[model samples]
Target: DISTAVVVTTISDGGFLDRLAPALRDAGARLIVIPDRNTGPALFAACERHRRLGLDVVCPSVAEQQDLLERLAVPDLIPYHSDNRRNVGYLMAWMEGFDVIVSMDDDNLPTTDDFVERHQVVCQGPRTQPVTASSDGWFNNCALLEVEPTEVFPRGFPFHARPAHAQARTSVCERPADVRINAGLWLGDPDVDAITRLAVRPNALAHSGGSVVLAEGTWCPVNSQNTAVHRDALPAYYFLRMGQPVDGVPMERFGDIFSGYFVQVCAQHLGHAVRFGDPVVEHPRNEHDLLDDLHKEVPAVRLLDDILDHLRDHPLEGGDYLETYESLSYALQEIAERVNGRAWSPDARAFLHRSAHLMRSWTGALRTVAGT
Candidate 1:
């Protein structure tokens, strides 16, 4: 049996949890809720109501977070918690000793009972195709948008990276391949940006219920909205600080998008594959100003190609998991330095350093658990 844990980071108490709880119970997976400091009384109320429903609510205060940082031996990440609460949830889930972690947003609910099973099957399966040098290049997996009545693209697809002819590439593998990261498709109110909705018919922008396995070299940005990370992939899944007004970008909107890039590169370097497909989630999105989202996505748009180029150019020598971890950390720090110019902020550097430290610790612990 696959032991899975569901992690969600939210600042509000929504009825979605009520709808989602049964499915979680049915799957026998633990539900972990990380409520940010800004969460209101409603969150507490929901926790009380769901206490008997097997939900674990983690609402750590600032002092508690500080204590946690010390306990984890990652004090440099303390400043990042206020905005990047999801990072805390990642650490919490890792400590719980689950085989896999499913990271979802409060607004996203499982479309079916097999949601957890699908995640487990994909990650544990051994059929994944290895990425080859010939096929290694930028790929836009949002080809599902092509069949729509109007044109559209996924949120993090680089405009410059689009193929001259916008078409989905055929899978190199005849069957589903082993994937370290599995990004579930969204059915209702897909995760496209305001610009996409404005350009394409909003209702027409849903993924068709078919899976596509990108051979090693292809890349697509997967959001945190509905994604699964295997136990071994947790180190690469760490989300950077975002949303706050910081260094070259807002970091908030770009966190998962950039993370997808980094992790995909890491997967390729480590000789693993990443998959995108069902079980789909229904995302009843909260209201957002399109203009605001567009503004926040600007920095990512400008740097998307550059980031990919940097990763592709600097292929790490993956002798083992530790070497892979070290290479990824340095690669990410290099990207940070390039984006922020010669004089990068101390906070940004600290983020990269602590992120490396955390990955090392996680990897080391996993080795110990395996008695390696």
Candidate 2:
């Protein structure tokens, strides 16, 4: 009995779109397609296919897009089209009497059938703002905004106001406010430059973690990818400022900006922010390969030795320190194989096997020693 709408904004990632629609329908959500002019017949066909599956698809008029463009300070990089007006239409749909509205991008694939259902549960219930999970190992894609019929402005809550202070004082409370107002997901693709310029104001900050914590206040933590916002309570400014870019762009400092600045803003605006003792969503993907690729310039010895030393000193016991060390050794062997112009040295091979064996044997002992 959940009545919800989804607006997906994309330039031309049809492969992602193909997977998105069916996933939304299976989750019981009505879907809307907002495409840039560049979208071809193939994309339209994909949208129609989703419609056949019982989701709502839409394309806003040129006038609407122009209006959005006027408000937006869209960078040269971003193609001006339906993608920029995603939040605009989503906010309008709120006025049209939809219970929940979601705006999403094309690249993400839905991970669960309960996505929309979960959003509705959070929006209609006690939670005010929610966000979605993303591939970046944290929440980035989805967001939920609490909608009350009488109010039309976006504001912060208590949890986000002074994050450093709260984190210093409390173990768990509620989400921060700045996290709520910001977009749920941020991509590192070419579009990032434009998106950051428009969406993130210069010097503004917030945490960009899992869907919930990143988009923390004014709604329960929800995924923007699989997100929900109460239609009635959505901000009028969100619709009016559709596609509008704030002055300046986000600094490229990664997570620090998000955690330091964005969370503070949301918390200050909202009356209070919520903090949680533990995370609601879980990320099980192993990012070792991706991280290694990104930081490949760092010497292998420094990386492996540092990690091993930390484990030895602090001790997570069953925390897989030895396994990690063995993995590092394995990586070392691969590196040496390339550098030495030979197959792995017999000593390296023997050492790796012994290390792995020792790591396995240490598991129970470490756990016992750590008292876990």
Candidate 3:
């Protein structure tokens, strides 16, 4: 067995996993299917059908999730009826002792046989180059995508980091450390925000080849879609608890963005590199209501840029993932309190504090379940 688990969450039965099962089996990797609210009966049937077809897949239902979650004590933290529930699959895969846990959206279909192999590249724990990027501590990952309208920003990209959009890359020489994360890109629609989708639509494809090992202290958004994380990075990465009410409208999106921010810093502190490149998936992105997406992303836009500033200005002093995450939480809390009512509304600031607290709660539960 490859000791790797591919985790995906879905609410439909589109034969998505069915099509990829053969490749997964060939790769000797396990699949964990998380069924979220409104996941049709077809999904339950499809999962069982896939298992019957002799694929290595596990689809845990509500009861099973609860039974498993009760052991970890964070049902209150992981709200129902949201994509954030994918955290359950992450939690499950981590505690199951998988060394490499990969996350994907149902729409990111395999475009090549190397899907599993490219993602597992992080398993190549060094003896490679850690390329540096020229910028103010940020590297624009979209620059690597080779998209038609080059330099498009991914959803949740910080405006503060935009200056680096046209900067240099491959600026390196440091020996690689263990790559704790591998973020694969897309061949179809790139993961840009709704505003970009409506303003300058793109069919993104990267003719560019070769992976990049980011030198320590260089950061980029490592989204859950087509991303892999080593077990060592788990404690630092929990999709930041979001969807909380902000001005009674509920700030949405940015869970994975905030999560990526935390994990990138954690990896840097713990002496690790993060890779971004191939095993490109064909992302015919799910149908999204563009206007609603814009609405949802509003708060995230205001917060992400400033949050990046806060993270860059502060220094982390922790010696481990959990410790580093705690330090980050405290840093966020301090920023939330300091900037309230000046930069963002009191409600938005409150939500930041709330998510900051939940970050610790979720990680603590993870460590509890992870067990020494």
- lDDT by residue (tens digit), candidate 2, 270-369: 3323222111122222223433332321221112222222222221111123333334334433443333312234443333344333333323233332
Candidate 3 achieves a global lDDT of 0.79
Among all candidates shown, the one with the greatest TM-score: 3
Compute the lDDT for candidate 1.
Answer: 0.65
lDDT of each: 0.65, 0.36, 0.79
The deviation in Å at residue 143 for candidate 2 is: 18
lDDT-superior candidate, 1 or 3: 3
Error of 1 at 216 (Å): 1.4
Encode model 1's per-residue lDDT on 66-151: one tens digit a residue.
67667555666534435456766666677777888888888878878888898885457666344322233555445553235554
What TM-scores do the predictions have?
0.82, 0.43, 0.93
The reply for model 3, stretches above 4 Å from the true place, is: 128-130, 167-170, 340-343
- Per-residue alpha-carbon lDDT of model 3 for 1-372, expressed as tens digits? 348899888887848876778778778788898887678788788887877677778898877888777877776877778888889888888888888888888877778887888777767665756576554666666767777764587887777667655654447666757788988888779988887888878768664756777777678888888888887787787887677665666678778888877888888877887788777788884666889988887767777777777777788878878889888898888888666344477777888788888988987897787576
Error of 1 at 54 (Å): 4.8
Between candidates 1 and 3, name the one with more favorable TM-score.
3
